[PDB]
């Protein structure tokens, strides 16, 4: 559980790079 | 500009892939 | 309804990404 | 440039099914 | 309609492959 | 030739079978 | 061999779609 | 249960296509 | 090549999404 | 199983697309 | 290029997503 | 602002890795 | 092996993510 | 066992030092 | 600048981390 | 090594947001 | 109170690496 | 040893003037 | 000021501690 | 070398706190 | 009963730090 939670963290940390990169380019 | 918009769909869905795994595990 | 609303935005990353396709080939 | 608008049809195709799979299931 | 959609949308898609079958062939 | 022509007129023919079914339905 | 499988599946889809049309009108 | 019968055969043409699309491309 | 396996690739989706609306509906 | 089936094609099918985008691009 | 080779990787990890999501399910 | 919002998201994923290293070892 | 393989995954996309924001920032 | 639990402290403290940065930014 | 910097040195971290937690899992 | 490798670098980061504090306040 | 408190940490774990090094040296 | 021990008492005495200046402050 | 310069000195020992924690150890 | 200049680095973080003590109090 | 303890624990640094002089001279 607890080491899913971490990808989940991982994940939503990587849509927000994400978003930026969008926003920016 | 379009490129951009793939990758947004892509970690999108990615995440909502992670959600899915953290409900049922 | 989680399974489908990935389903669904799979499809929507892969209709973006052969649009793509058409475009650039 | 034909076979592209194979590829773009087949797709629109595909996303239509599964938005009818998400509205049924 | 969308069951008729996706059947119109899919008989497209057959006829544009066989118009690619015969300038191939 | 002659076959690559059937296969086409056939294709045809089962197209606007279709379109008259959406119209119809 | 697998044009004349084309050929015949075309022509069964045909038919069908001709059998509908009766139905309906 | 019809029109689904009909796209069904439609998806089987397709598809038959599309593997003499793939031998002659 | 590339574009003729992605086609094929497009249709067994599509003649799975296909399936499931049959079964369903 | 089918929703998971059509769910892994998709995913296959738009692994293959962004691979001839990152050959043709 | 960069930003291709992210949109690879990201592709990678939905499917491998996916494909534990298929074992699990 | 979104920057800041990634680092803070960035940091606690590592949190919650280090948590985790710290757990099994 | 494999939610740890995709935590690895994640983590390599976040990180080429993160590299092409210096590089654009 | 003394190590990871400095490990632990300074992911406390790059946390803190963080979330300083966001309020103040 | 100094944002971006420190984002890619707590990425890097990050990564380190999964990649112990990969080895040791 | 792999564990102080991480530590060291928990260090660098640290200090990179106590310098940007330090320029901020 | 909270750059105090971020002292506060800083110092500790300070005095956890020093520990440490008592150990080691 | 002599220079550990001293390290060691002058990090205690820092950390019980950072403990009142977070007191004071 | 103040509190920022010794909170500065502070990180500025502990990465002096950490960088001879990876020597000894 | 390290050892002793980490523990000067320590003195003047020591010195700059009582200097704050005594501006406060 | 703070300002006398940290008053007695420089004293006993600093008495510390004699005997290295005394030791090393």
Known sequence: S???EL???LSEA???AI???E???
Do not use: A, F, I, P
Request: no cysteine; aromatic share 6%.
């Open 2 to 4: 607890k080491l899913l």
């Open 7 to 9: 990808l989940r963290k």
């Open 14 to 16: 990587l849509h927000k």
């Open 19 to 21: 978003e930026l990169l």
């Open 23 to 25: 926003k920016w380019g």
